[PDB]
Amino acid sequence: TRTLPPGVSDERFDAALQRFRDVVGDKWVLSTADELEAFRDPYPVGAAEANLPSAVVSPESTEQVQDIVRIANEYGIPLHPVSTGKNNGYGGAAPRLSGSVIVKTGERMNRILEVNEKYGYALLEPGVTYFDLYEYLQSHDSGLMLDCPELGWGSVVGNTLDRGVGYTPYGDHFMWQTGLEVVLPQGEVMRTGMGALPGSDAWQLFPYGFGPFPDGMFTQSNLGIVTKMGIALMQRPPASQSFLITFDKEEDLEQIVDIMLPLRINMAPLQNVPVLRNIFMDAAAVSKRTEWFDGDGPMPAEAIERMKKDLDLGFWNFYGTLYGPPPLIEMYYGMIKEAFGKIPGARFFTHEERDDRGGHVLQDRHKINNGIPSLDELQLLDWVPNGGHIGFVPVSAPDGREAMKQFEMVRNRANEYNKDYMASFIIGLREMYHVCLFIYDTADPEAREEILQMTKVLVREAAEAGYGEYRTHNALMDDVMATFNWGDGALLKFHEKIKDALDPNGIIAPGKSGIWPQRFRGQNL
Amino acid sequence: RTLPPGVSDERFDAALQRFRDVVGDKWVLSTADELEAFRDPYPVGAAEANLPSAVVSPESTEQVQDIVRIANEYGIPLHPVSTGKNNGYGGAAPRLSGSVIVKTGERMNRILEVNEKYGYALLEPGVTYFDLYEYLQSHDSGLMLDCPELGWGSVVGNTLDRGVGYTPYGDHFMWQTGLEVVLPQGEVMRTGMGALPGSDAWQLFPYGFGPFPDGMFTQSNLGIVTKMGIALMQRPPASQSFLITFDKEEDLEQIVDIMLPLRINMAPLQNVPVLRNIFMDAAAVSKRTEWFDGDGPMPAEAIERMKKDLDLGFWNFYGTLYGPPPLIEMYYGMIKEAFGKIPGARFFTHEERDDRGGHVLQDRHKINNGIPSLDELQLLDWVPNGGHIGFVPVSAPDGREAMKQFEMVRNRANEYNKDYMASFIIGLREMYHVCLFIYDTADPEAREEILQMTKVLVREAAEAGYGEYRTHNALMDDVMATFNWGDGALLKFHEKIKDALDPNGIIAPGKSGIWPQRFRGQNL
Ligand SMILES: *Cc1cc2c(cc1C)nc1c(=O)[nH]c(=O)nc-1n2C[C@H](O)[C@H](O)[C@H](O)COP(=O)(O)OP(=O)(O)OC[C@H]1O[C@@H](n2cnc3c(N)ncnc32)[C@H](O)[C@@H]1O
Ligand SMILES: *Cc1cc2c(cc1C)nc1c(=O)[nH]c(=O)nc-1n2C[C@H](O)[C@H](O)[C@H](O)COP(=O)(O)OP(=O)(O)OC[C@H]1O[C@@H](n2cnc3c(N)ncnc32)[C@H](O)[C@@H]1O
Ligand SMILES: C=CCc1ccc(O)c(OC)c1
Ligand SMILES: C=CCc1ccc(O)c(OC)c1
Ligand SMILES: [Ca+2]
Ligand SMILES: [Ca+2]
Known part of the structure; x- marks a missing residue:
């Protein structure tokens, strides 16, 4: 029947719901099964029901968030704070603890508080999407560009608070995070850094302020509800070029990673976040699985060759973007061609050189890598009917043999649980991310359970090999x-x-x- | 005899022996003569302050645990330092009088790893910038370190007070990656991938999983750090250091305003831009009495003599460029066109000045290339028994803000009869007004003048919306x-x-x- 907070009666919850309504207003408290369906994990994991929200409260202000927090303390109601609640791959809006009330900050606290052209920063409420901030910069003829993930519909703040990543030189969102306001778990409000000094202009200029640096403690965290966050914004460069490198062989992964790292560790000539995507990932972005193989079980070699041939892609496809005056872009591209050119079968394409279906991912990277938010990458979920995904992302040393071991280890388990291996190898400066998106039928309880049991195995095996998830x-x-x-x-x-x-x-x-x-x-x- | 608060002669003597039982008899100092060397070398205020009760030098993480456990038993306060060279901020001296200094760096001074492939070091507290530079030279390293002005400090200890250098890796805490810490009751913890047994990425990925705590152990009292990782930048194929002299006090506004646009995209100003006033550069190469032996603030005549003699401006800009010579030349050209719009601006590369005035440029060429130095210790010869205090409000990188801050501080410096040694330094979007007040450490009134002057500067800066870093x-x-x-x-x-x-x-x-x-x- 009715989802309740742990150890909280029908009466006590009804009382608390009304106290919530007294703060935010009647239409900003959802608690009917019909109203809550939209806040369930859109990509559910496991056959059983899990991660069941009891209610959604939409506050309008920091003070309302304080009031909600103080009521939640009174009644022992657990609160799951989100921004836009688009954490799809990691649970969407759904709370870890069933019976928790979702505080959707982003519904009404969705205001751009400041975009400073001179110092290159924004002060944002949780509700500000990448599309909102992009539209604002366009409107105001800004000299600035944002850094977005693959999907523009998420929160600049919310994404930062789970230490999400994009693909411009400013791709480490939490680094560039500068100052936040947070309601602590008993309701008092706090500003970090120069925010803590009344009348400072430097909230979004100096990250550390004075004494212990706490901002990190509010990322992948449950130490409060964030109501404002500052972020630095890069100046848009005068030009940019995006390029694809197709690599013909599964085994090329070793040489690709080993050539990638020296080209990246000095942030040149690979200026942006280098992403290496397997043919499965790129095929899923432009095609249905059944276009290639309608059989049961893992995709055969003939089918993979047909994908590569038809899309004119390799087994591994490298995507990068260069920024600055055209001479500098051409110099960097020349270095990149010489270094990756030593891999037999490496082929090179700029964004101007591929208007075919295989090129659609390159065209999307050219947008995302230039801080132009997109939703093209939602097409991934049409790989199979009713497609959802779970993110599995272990952190690795950026070594070719270390990538090769992870490639084998994960594809092997994927095969065993009848899930395709959609994988990217991505590198920051000195770390490697094995970004695995398992695409499955969300309607199929067996597929859901397979995903839960497979990823439990993948976590344990990855940890046994000294790989932690980010x-x-x-x-x-x-x-x-x-x-x-x-x-x-x-x-x-x-x-x-x-x-x-x-x-x-x-x-x-x-x-x-x-x-x-x-x-x-x-x-x- | 200095005792911990609420701790008797007999309880302390017991505790000192327990410390001896852990670290050895030799590695516990508690006589007034032994402790002298650990007093603030640049004492602030007339009155005695910041008195250590003892110094304990542990050899290992395990020993740090045992000391912290003993401290818990007896309620002894512990002041953990690395090398204890925090000169200008108290040196090795504890905030709380009666605290035992735990000098981790004395014996825990081992370079645990330098990874050439991934460009990082895993270090104990006692590794000085000289130690780590010597190592890199010995091993024909492709890597360079990032040092502050003085090489005798700790890579770790400087990072733990969020210290800064002047290479592209100037933000020490940013590049800090993984630490090990003994928490206040003696348990030991590793941050980031350090927390995953057998991970290779301790020094590769800073955040690990869940809340990011490393920041909480900087300018902090939440534990004793026993290991710390830090990324090291690859040494680029060439570098060029340059000095821009600016003739006028009032040039500060236009310098800072041209400086921000060239810095925010980390090009063409690739390293940390430092603007030093003539007082700063003069005190680096000369005594005060060479220019003015009279009492009170230094007259205009004397400032003009400093400028002429050293062939420097009132404001002196020091930068370094890195990469292929064609890139360095392009960037230097942009810098010359931009700052050239200030009348009286003059340009010098490190190759073009072998005179005394050029000595600071030469020291920056070293520092900005990760070659540690002690040349800047000469600042302390400005007056007899010279010490300094660090006063560094954080500012918007704006000309008129720099100008307001310049007046505000010089006026109060004048009022308390201290010279105005100041640099304006800029990260990406923030500005540091670095003020070193050099004074006679043997003069109790000069000491009190410093304390009262800086108290005034602190709340006056805060009233203007400027916090100290x-x-x-x-x-x-x-x-x-x-x-x-x-x-x-x-x-x-x-x-x-x-x-x-x-x-x-x-x-x-x-x-x-x-x-x-x-x-x-x-x-x-
Ligand atoms: C399916 C998918 C997902 C995806 C992706 C590609 C595909 C096909 N590519 C991504 C990428 O390139 N980079 C990245 O970082 N994520 C990527 N994802 C995952 C996801 O789409 C995005 O990360 C998305 O932007 C995150 O969701 P959102 O931005 O809406 O953030 P949230 O769900 O509202 O909040 C995230 C979590 O943080 C905590 N949180 C959020 N707000 C607060 C506040 N105000 N206070 C306290 N904590 C907060 C919560 O734990 C919440 O779950
Ligand atoms: C006089 C002076 C000072 C100075 C400078 C120029 C002059 C003329 N230039 C500096 C510069 O360019 N950049 C900079 O960051 N500092 C500069 N200074 C100040 C000072 O000399 C240096 O910062 C120096 O590196 C600091 O001294 P040291 O490196 O020896 O650090 P420490 O005293 O040992 O530690 C600093 C504080 O951090 C905490 N700490 C240290 N180690 C630990 C451990 N293991 N665990 C816990 N906390 C630790 C303490 O609070 C300690 O006081
Ligand atoms: C090809 C990149 C997709 C991607 C990157 C980072 C992520 O965290 C993620 O989460 C599911 C997905
Ligand atoms: C002339 C620069 C010296 C300097 C720079 C940064 C600092 O924190 C500092 O501390 C006292 C001194
Ligand atoms: Ca082939
Ligand atoms: Ca023991």
Whole structure:
């Protein structure tokens, strides 16, 4: 029947719902099954129901977020704060803890508070999407560009608060995060950095302020509800060129990664975040699985060759963008061609050179890499009927043999659980991300369970090989946090200890990143 | 005899022996003669302050655990340092008098790893910039380090006070990647991929999984750091350092305003731009008495003599470029066209000045190329028994803000009879007004003048909306008090976390104005 917060009666919840309505207004509290359906994980993981929200409250202001937090303390209601709630791949808007109330900050707190052309920064509310901020910069003939992930409909703030990434030189969103406002778990409000000094202009200029630097503690965290966040914005460069390098062989991965890293570690000639996508990923962006293979089980070699041939793509496809005066772009492109040119079968294409279906991903990278938000990459989910995805992203050293081992290890398990291997190898400066998107039929309970059991295996095996996940789904946060158990889980004990100090009543997103406040510890949900 | 607060002669003597049982008899100092060397070398205020009770030098992480556990038992406050060279901010001296200094760097001074492939170091606290430079030279490294002005500090300890250098990797804390820390009750923790047993990425990926804590251990008293990683930048094929002299006090406005556009895209100004006033560059190469032996502020005549003799401006801009010679030349050309629009602007590369005035340029050419130096110690010869205090408000990188800040500080410096040694430094979007006040450390009134002058500068800067990035023991309470948005919400947040991790209030009480429960309200 009715989803309730843990240890909270029908009466007590009805009372708390009304207190919420007194703060934000009747139409900004959802609690009917019909109203809540939209806030369930759109890509559900596992056959069983999980991650069930009891209600959605949409606050209009920081003060309203304080009031909601104080009520949640009164009634012991757990709050799952989101911005836009588009964390698709990691649970969407759905709370880790079933019965939690979703605080959708972004519905009404969606205002651009400042875009400074002189100093190159924005001060944003959670509700500001990449499309909102893009449209604002266009409107105002801005000299600035934003840094967006593959999908423009997410929150600049929300994405930053899960340490999301884009593909411009400003792709590490949390680095460029500068100052935030946060409602702490008992309702008091705090500004970090120069925000903490009344009348400073430097909130979005100097990240650290004075004393311990806390902003990090509010990312992949449950230590408060963020109401404002500053972010630095790069100046748009005078020109840019996007290029695709197709690599013919599965085994080329080793040489590609080993040539990638020297070209990237000095942020030149690879100026942007280098992404290497397998043919599955690029095929899924432009085609249905059944275009290639309507059989059961893993995709055969003949089918993969047909994908490569028809799309004129390799097994591994490298995407990069260069920025600056055309001479500098041409110099950097020349270096890139010489270095990756030593791999037999490497073929090169600029964004101007491919208008065919195989080229559509390059055209999308040319947008995303230039801070032009897109939703083209939603086409991935038409690979199979009713397509959803889960993100599996272990962090690796950027070595060719280390990539090769991860390639084998994950494709092998993928095959066993009848899921295709959609994978990208991405490099920051000195780290490698194995970005695996498993696409499955969300309507099929067996496919959902296969995904939950497969990724549980993939997490454990990756950790046995010394690979930690940078980010994970609601279903895997306990399993993943368990892997960071150096010194008898010293890290988790440190986090719990702080969680209990700031959230004595255990209100804020209990179980986020495997961090449960005292009142829930040992209870298996 | 200096004792910890609320600890008897007999309890302390017991505790000193327990320390000896852990680290050895030789590695516990507690005589007045032994402790002299660990007093603030640039003392602030007339009165005695910042008195250590003992110095304990541990050999290992395990020993640090044992010391912290003993400290918890006896309620002894511990001030963890690396090398203890935080000169201008108290040196090795503890904020709280009676604290035991834990000099981690004395014996924990080992380079644990330098990775040529991935460009990083994993370091203990005692590794100095000289130590790590020597290592890189020895091993024919492709890598360069990022050092502050003085090479004798700790790579780790400087990072833990969010210190800065002048290469593209000038933000030390940014490039910090992984640490190991002994938390205030003696348990040991590794951050990031350090927390995943057998990961290779401790020094490759900073964040790891869940909340990002590393920042909480910088300008902090939440533990004793025993290892720290840091990224090292590949040495580029060539570099060129350059000096722009600017003739006029009033040029500051246009310098800062041309400086920001050339810096924010990290090109053409590829390194940290530093603008030094003639006082700064003169004190680097000469004594005060060479220019003016009279009492009180230095007259216009004397300033003009400094400029002529050293062939420098009132404001001197020092930068470095890196890469292929064609790139360096292109960038230098853009810099010359931009700053050239200021009348009286003159340009010199490091190759074009072998005179005394050029000595600072030569020292920057070293520092900006990750070659540690001690040349800038000559600043302390400006007056007899020279010491300095660091006063560094953070500002918008705006000409008129720089100009306001220049007047505001020089006026108060004048009033308290201290010379105005100042640099304007710029990261990407922020500006540091770095003011070194050089004074006679043997003169109790010069000491009191410094304390009272900087107290005034701190609240006057705060009234103008400027916060300090970093400050001295004597000012930490005053400085933290200025960050009082939402009724001092930030300090309240820091205090709850301090009390959660340090229930006995052991680790560096009062660091950054953060006192644990047992000390709050006691005025030391
Ligand atoms: C399916 C998919 C997903 C995807 C992607 C490609 C595909 C095909 N590419 C991505 C990429 O390139 N980079 C990236 O970082 N993510 C990518 N994803 C995943 C996802 O689409 C995006 O990351 C998305 O932008 C994230 O969702 P959103 O931006 O809406 O953020 P949120 O869901 O509202 O909040 C995220 C989490 O952070 C915490 N949170 C959020 N807001 C707050 C506030 N105000 N206070 C406290 N905590 C907050 C919550 O834990 C929330 O779940
Ligand atoms: C006088 C002076 C000072 C100076 C400078 C120029 C002059 C003329 N130029 C500097 C510069 O360009 N950049 C910079 O960051 N600092 C500069 N200074 C100040 C100072 O000399 C240096 O910053 C110096 O590197 C700091 O000294 P050191 O490196 O020895 O650091 P420390 O005293 O040992 O530690 C600093 C503080 O951090 C905490 N700490 C240190 N180690 C630990 C450990 N292991 N665990 C926990 N906390 C630790 C303490 O609070 C300590 O006081
Ligand atoms: C090809 C990149 C897609 C992608 C990148 C980073 C992510 O975190 C992600 O989450 C599911 C998806
Ligand atoms: C002339 C630059 C010296 C300098 C720079 C940054 C600092 O923090 C500092 O501390 C006292 C001194
Ligand atoms: Ca072939
Ligand atoms: Ca032992």
